[PDB]
Design a protein around this ligand. Structure first.
Ligand SMILES: N#CSCCOc1ccc(Oc2ccccc2)cc1
Ligand SMILES: N#CSCCOc1ccc(Oc2ccccc2)cc1
Lengths: 334, 334, 334, 334, 334, 334
């Protein structure tokens, strides 16, 4: 009924893409809680990406973003991005944020707050060690997973255990993030953003951008494959997180994004396309089309099938051939 | 293990290739009840469809159909339609009808008595107002939903609320009906038949038949869009209706058609093909292919997904552009 | 973290290409129980198919296989079949077998024992009658269905009844064999092995191999259709069996295969290609693709659909046209 | 089915008055796992209590007990304790230990390795410091709680958290150990042992045995009151650990001992008969007369009732009376 | 962890006993909410009870009690009632009251408003009609049944129906107040207080106080029985009320006191001890000693037994014997 | 609010000492159904028991009991048994029975029929062999278990599997019958009725009544023990049966009887005070008074405890020992 709430769902469908539908499917209060949550995240996300905002002007924005949730007339008109509309009409979003029960307000504010400090910290530095790839991924994605779990339990739709287990919640995020950072290498390159860990790619090329020179494609796919091998290590936690859920609408919201992330890594493994444009998700084995990601056992079968897709395609000469089998074997066994 | 009951199920798969499977999949008593219901609804429709039967013979036939269900020896050997075997051997079908529990017999007969009356009024008329469109659809579709619902509740597999809310039940039918009417424009024109409400197509041309003329495609696709917008207004009741279902066999039976209907609508929206033959229902985003209509949340997700598929295609230049956005916007926030 | 168990799952994915994912999706202790059960079953099957092993040498092996499960150093190094590794590295498999709960061990060994006996007894004779065809099938598939059931009941995941009703368990496996047999006619032909019951093809030709002859192709199909008719009689039992399951992961494990089996019978029915190539699985009505084999009503639906694909293709001119219909008729009225 | 297992349970009942019933009530695999875990822990405890064993001879056995679990023939025929049966027929128990799944095996052994180390360590010394009292309880009680917690999570019947949070797991054991030590003052005093932390009783007397003398019981029921106050500090952790449980059998197994533990501390608080024989638990107030420890809220209620049964008997005259009210007021406010 | 909240619970355990434990065992938000509610209610109760407070002065205090909650400094220093501490330190409680969510404060203050209006209204009279008894109990207990209920629905731990249905929430408070009034007859008389409905006892004696005289015993017992039969009527609502609860902590909070009440009526029925001392509620029995009040079916079984226990003890000659049966019959068969 | 119904519940409490309270606790339609089912069974039993009836007038009555349930004016004012009210006022009961859903009537009638046939079959003969003692118990109690199980599934409060498992359903009944048969040796003898099986006591004494003679008290106990041992052999089915129940009210109804039976068996095991008076249930160990029989793990604790009390008192003297041990250890590992 609200005009503002109506407006928040218009932005949800503008800014989002593949999440709007599963979010709107959420039971009861989560529906609005998660919608507003993604909107503020989308706004804070836009502030970080905007390169026309000097770092000295951006740091204060990121740090205090969370405090703007309580400033009715706050907003940013200087954005140049595409999703800048959530920023220009932020007061509309703030308004509904303050209509949420406060148990949701607390979680949302808290996450924005820690995410702001994290985004700022990385404003003037590229990711080095894998250990930091996890740190940067924890700030832009992990916290979101931790945030969502806390809102699920808050609402009483999921067991309080879901939200308490932050480590695994964090993994849900790290998996979707690394997978995305991996798929978008070229999109982020011809964009001026570098996310691939340096202590990794610096073992194959002089500059992360060199992986776009067809002359280093073989070395590029070796790095892609190493990073993919890395992301895979989060699957076990993923399966543990999902296995805990008891609300269908939540399950769907959570299981789907992960299964597409898996199919994606599968489509990208030892795949040259990653460095020449877009890698299209396809179809693996009959059963994948036979059963759908709406129940736990099925999500497992779907995942194991993608795992084999990669397994069966592991080059014996790949610098990471063995570790790739190691984690895949661990996943399918235990 | 009656031979007549086997005959019945043979006729069902013969005259209901589409819903036959799911009907046979229904639990306990709902099964046979819904099977007979479709056979007697098939028969009545067969008489209506039959153009060789004079209005003089057809009117009493439609009007008294519900009474033929208790006349052990009634039969119609003069039909020239294809599903007429249900009329020539109606005694078998009616034998199984009087075989059901009095409670089902009540619903079915009542629908047949009201459907016959209604089908009779429209024998010599076309649909004029949008009101007459809801009238006709009610007579040939809504009642079906109102009858089906009343059967679901009668059996106690679904709460009484399902059978009570005749308005929601009616919408279930109007959505499907209005949808097929929109999709079948062409083949209905190539069959000397009109269903599109005149008060609407008249504002675009002098004859419903003009939409088939290349020179009027633009006007045709504008009327199409309008009528579609009209149809969209039933979505909330459909979601509401489906949301109340507790039994899986019934959910499967009810959800699939509706999803099929929304997809069909998303496919036709702003598509010139609707006027050049049968239109193609295009795939669905990835969040759909990893889901199917077996649990409510997922069904919302598929629906919401197709409405956005439509929102993306709405052109400012369309006369309905603004109402289409509006109703979709409303379905999005409830 | 057992490396044997890891190796075991490597083999499961090497040998049971398909089932592998649904097996791994099994809950708790059924997973390793079923995985190991498939590995030892596959080994046994590999000794029985290897033809470089004289009959005199093979029986003592088939007979004592169930006891080699307890001989830690036992392995076979003379097989020349493709999945011979399960036999050459059997010590690894029996190691993890002896690690299962003693109650599962009891079950598995009992089936391997009774299975070896059956296999041995059919090395010196081909299948003659249908009664004999069910006997061979019981020995290589029926007992597996019985074994899998006793395991489900023992793990307490399923009702005690699942494992007690052996006739139904028997049917789950018979329906599968008869299928794979009917579909692997050609491949099993050029292999020197004959599985079609002598009493059926004997009254169509003199040599089973004849059907491979592009001339009596029409004689073949008639037989093909007569055997498929034989198979269909198992469905009533598959459905009854699947309708008792209550554990989701177990249902997934059981429904899927049965569903692919029926889809295959549909594809093959009246298809001349069964005798010329690899009949591939076709699609199912838009209503089939809307569901998945994960709930009982959907399975019943999918199955019924595949029933129709067969039912309205039955040529009157076929020797089995009347039985092919009485059975599909009986299936529609359970 | 196996005799070895039947024997283990015969021993489970000979060594455990009450506990054998609740362990035997554990679901699926944690039943056998805990029955074996308790038998080896008993055998270990037996070796540790047998005085007719040279320290120079006992230290190795305690440091090496964990390893005998892998030696089929190991056993000890030179004990003269009440439960030597588990020592003389340890091969029977060790056999069933190696039949448990590898994952329960690593837990049980690892805890025997660590337990047996601490046991040996407190052979030549006595409990001095209070945090040394915590250290002792950890080696004979804490670790068992930590062990069981790992078995519960390893079996998936309980959440991963239950096993991961070793701190709360530990308190579970510390609470039962201190309550049991306090209650058995006289018993442990005629047997020739001293578990009461020296740094505590020393402030009140010169020899722990002094508390037994009539002319001292006023410094004895001040020391006793001071310990209970310490133990009381574990409750918050006991509520947290019990609150994470979701399986009924495990909840009954965990909740009862703890409840029986508080009741004991509330029957011994500022009571004199503690130093004049053992103490009895005569019923729990009305609310605790209508509810048993099967659900979490009941358990809390029950626990709070005993806190107040203590809060009332706190004589302002007592020295710890202050922090005693402090801990109690804390346990109830959160 | 506020010392103000710490003390609030100190008083909770100080004033309420049969509630302190279960209140503190309430889930999340309703814990502190209910705690505080019971504190102000006790404060208001203490006032309407202090006889050292001339009217004129009292009326105001009761009327303006709900307003003292928002007046940070308010407090009563002239109370000579044991509980006075909750008034003298009322600020501490008003402090924590204002810390609660708004919707909880809405309920608390609204009840305290009405409760005071009624209390003052009875300052100048005695309960005459049976109606007057029902509504005196409405102002001091029914409203507390309604208060809590609304707090249960606000926290959303219970459906909205619980807080909606005021009649049921009314019978809950009326069953206790009456049970206590009946049982607390003597004590009240010696306290110079009268609550028994005059139009009832006046038919037996000239003054309510006559039941204290040994000579009037028999007649006193018949009145006791007429009142007891009166209270037995709220039982159908009680069972109904408890049937709708879904939260375990809430069920405990509600079932317990009610089951405690029946137990007391069963104990006082036709028991002349009720006029000489206090009655010791004769514990459960063979089937009620097998259960507790943590699940509806159990509670019912418990309720029904105490009913038969009263039934089989009804003397034919008892003036009310005919109704005590009529009602007990209703409860059985409903 | 039905007069005849209120009468039925009045007869339920008269005839049924205890079950009455739990029966009235059943959910929805089971409440009246079982009450009614209990009443007709109390009637049909009163007949058989009546020894002031012929044997040629008793048979038809028994053989035709089930028929009377459809004869409004039926009644039997000729019985001289304690519960003759159910016979003399049978129309009040039949009327209500005819109020039950058809599905319920179906079951109950059927049970009465099959039952009568068995009852009539045993007045001519005596229980000779055990396989016959099972037959009798089957006819007078096992069938009741089957009936109840069916009504449970029919009601849909329990999975269809509950009612489909007639074997364990039978054990439920047999375990009880054998219990009361054993406990009531004198009562049944001082009534001229013999129920103990020949082959058992026969190998002990000549006059089955000899056990009432102080000269063979041993021989009486050893037989007693021998029979108990035969009875304990049903517990596994009992534990399994209860393990299948999902409805609380249904569980309380089933579990409690069983728990009391086992209570009695242990109460009477190797106890001579059985052939000289009524033996009544003692108390349970520590753990039990913390366990109401309302959840399965709890019930298991209780059963395993009683199994233990018996085990501890098995004399090496008694002949049937070893068997008593053999069976009890088997229960320990379920
Ligand atoms: N804006 C922005 S950033 C959006 C992408 O980062 C995410 C996304 C999801 C998420 O956790 C989920 C948990 C379960 C399923 C799906 C998601 C954590 C991090
Ligand atoms: N290796 C080898 S032999 C594999 C083929 O034999 C089967 C296969 C499955 C089965 O039962 C199942 C029950 C339901 C679904 C799938 C299986 C019984 C016999």
């Amino acid at each position: 009924l609200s005009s503002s709430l109506k407006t928040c769902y218009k932005y949800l469908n503008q800014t989002s893409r593949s999440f709007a539908a599963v979010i709107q499917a959420l039971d009861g209060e989560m529906r609005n809680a998660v919608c507003i949550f993604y909107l503020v995240l989308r706004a804070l996300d836009t502030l970080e990406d905007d390169m026309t905002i000097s770092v000295e002007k951006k740091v204060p924005l990121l740090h205090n973003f969370h405090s703007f949730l309580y400033q009715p007339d706050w907003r940013f008109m200087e954005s140049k991005e595409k999703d800048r509309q959530v920023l220009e009409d932020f007061p509309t979003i703030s308004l509904e944020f303050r209509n949420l029960a406060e148990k949701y307000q607390t979680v949302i504010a808290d996450i924005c707050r820690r995410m702001g400090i994290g985004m700022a910290e990385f404003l003037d530095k590229h990711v080095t060690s894998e250990q930091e790839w996890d740190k940067y991924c924890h700030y832009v994605a992990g916290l979101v997973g931790i945030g969502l779990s806390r809102l699920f339990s808050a609402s009483e739709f999921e067991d309080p255990l879901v939200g308490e287990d932050t480590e695994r919640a964090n993994s849900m995020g790290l998996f979707l993030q690394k997978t995305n950072i991996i798929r978008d290498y070229l999109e982020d390159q011809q964009g001026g953003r570098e996310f691939w860990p340096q202590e990794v790619w610096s073992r194959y090329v002089k500059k992360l951008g060199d992986f776009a020179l067809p002359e280093n494609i073989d070395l590029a796919v070796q790095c892609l494959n190493e990073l993919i091998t890395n992301a895979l290590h989060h699957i076990p936690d993923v399966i543990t997180y999902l296995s805990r859920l008891r609300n269908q609408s939540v399950f769907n919201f959570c299981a789907i994004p992960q299964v597409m992330a898996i199919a994606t890594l599968a489509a990208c493994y030892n795949n040259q396309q990653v460095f020449k444009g877009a890698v299209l998700i396809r179809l693996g084995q009959a059963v994948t089309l036979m059963m759908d990601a709406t129940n736990m056992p099925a999500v497992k079968a779907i995942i194991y099938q993608y795992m084999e897709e990669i397994y069966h395609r592991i080059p014996d000469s790949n610098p990471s051939s063995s570790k790739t089998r190691q984690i895949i074997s661990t996943i399918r066994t235990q």
